[PDB]
Scaffold this active site. Structure first.
Site: not given
Ligand SMILES: NC1=N[C@@]2(c3cccc(-c4cncnc4)c3)CCOC[C@H]2O1
Length: 373
Positions: A223, A34
């Site tokens: 991102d 992430d």
């Molecule tokens: N970048 C990011 N990470 C976050 C996140 C959290 C849980 C799942 C996913 C995700 C779901 N499905 C595909 N990909 C990731 C992404 C947390 C921090 O900010 C909000 C979200 O955005």
């Protein structure tokens, strides 16, 4: 970097993960990669969507930091207990780090059924770490404790059950076998998110003609943890209007354009050519220069789910700025050059391209756009 190639996996729309180990003896976990956050956090208690979780008491090298952490998102939240432990990436660099770990003990709408990941690797900067910027992110620890160069790169590749996807996270360097043509760099505007500046947007060669502050209102970020291309309201509406016009030959339901409903075609008959290319022009290292990344419908129509090919529109509206998510990153090789405060883009070895069009990285183009202060 050969041992790191194809070290990422995932399900379409559910993120890309890398295998990691935590503790002694090592506990194997799949961890979401992430670039949109800065905490290393792992499931540490039973949850209906978790195959497995981090068991601190089974690790001889666990150290409790005796501090809680609460992390709410727009959708979903989790709370946990902070500590440190030894962490490795088996298909990464041959090193072991003592890293901060948020052990997740309670959560709501965070873990995703079937995603096959059990935690999150926040690769962004300390400024956005929780509880605050004193909690050193994983990559910072990695660089400080080992001789691994301060750079990583992501090659995210595009694709019953959700389609499996793959890719590579190359830590500590650039693997030239993963891209063709030139690498173009855009500055990292500020080290918090991986913030960048978009100076121009075209749909099928046609300029949206908006004041460029609109494209970065209130920020633009790269991102890997967001599936979609997310655009600020004004930009989103103009983009949809243009995509509709170009594909007007056919008509789709409203819920489709809203990124909710599917559109399906007879297997192999998807009319890619009625959908336009999108070009995002990123600020160059030189003040009045830019380069463009050109994305195809094969990127922004994301496959889902017999004998029908179905897709979701992977562009959506944002109230927190532009997000260049995974569907944008797919088919580019993206270099997060932390050392030189810049992000590189090149056409990926696994990029998409049909008979007439291809994803491209092209510059320079020559002609203030930053919004948040
Ligand atoms: N970048 C990011 N990470 C976050 C996140 C959290 C849980 C799942 C996913 C995700 C779901 N499905 C595909 N990909 C990731 C992404 C947390 C921090 O900010 C909000 C979200 O955005």
């Amino acid at each position: 970097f050969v041992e790191m190639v194809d070290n990422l996996r995932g399900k379409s729309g559910q993120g890309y993960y890398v295998e990691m180990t935590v503790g002694s003896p090592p506990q194997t976990l799949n961890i979401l990669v992430d670039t949109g956050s800065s905490n290393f956090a792992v499931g540490a208690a039973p949850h209906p969507f978790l195959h497995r979780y981090y068991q601190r008491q089974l690790s001889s090298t666990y150290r409790d930091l005796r501090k809680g952490v609460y992390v709410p998102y727009t959708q979903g939240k989790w709370e946990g207990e902070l500590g440190t432990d030894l962490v490795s990436i088996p298909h990464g660099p041959n090193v072991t780090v003592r890293a901060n770990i948020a052990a997740i003990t309670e959560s709501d709408k965070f873990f995703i059924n079937g995603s096959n990941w059990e935690g999150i690797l926040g690769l962004a900067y300390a400024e956005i770490a929780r509880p605050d910027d004193s909690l050193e992110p994983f990559f910072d620890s990695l660089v400080k404790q080992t001789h691994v160069p301060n750079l990583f790169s992501l090659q995210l590749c595009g694709a019953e059950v959700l389609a499996s996807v793959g890719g590579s996270m190359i830590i500590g360097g650039i693997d030239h076998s993963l891209y063709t043509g030139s690498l173009w760099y855009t500055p990292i505007r500020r080290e918090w998110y991986y913030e960048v500046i978009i100076v121009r947007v075209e749909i099928n060669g046609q300029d949206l003609k908006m004041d460029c502050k609109e494209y970065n209102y209130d920020k633009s970020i790269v991102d890997s943890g967001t599936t979609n291309l997310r655009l600020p309201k004004k930009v989103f509406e103009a983009a949809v209007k243009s995509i509709k016009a170009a594909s007007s030959t056919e008509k789709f339901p409203d819920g489709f354009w809203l990124g909710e409903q599917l559109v399906c075609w007879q297997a192999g008959t998807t009319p890619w050519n009625i959908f336009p290319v999108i070009s995002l022009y990123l600020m160059g290292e030189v003040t009045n220069q830019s380069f463009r990344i050109t994305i195809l419908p094969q990127q922004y129509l994301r496959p889902v789910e017999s004998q029908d090919d179905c897709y979701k529109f992977a562009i959506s509206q944002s109230s927190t700025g532009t997000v260049m998510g995974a569907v944008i990153m797919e088919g580019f090789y993206v270099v997060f050059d932390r050392a030189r405060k810049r992000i590189g883009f090149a056409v990926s070895a696994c990029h998409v391209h049909d008979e007439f069009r291809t994803a491209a990285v092209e510059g320079p183009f020559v002609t203030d756009c930053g919004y948040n202060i």
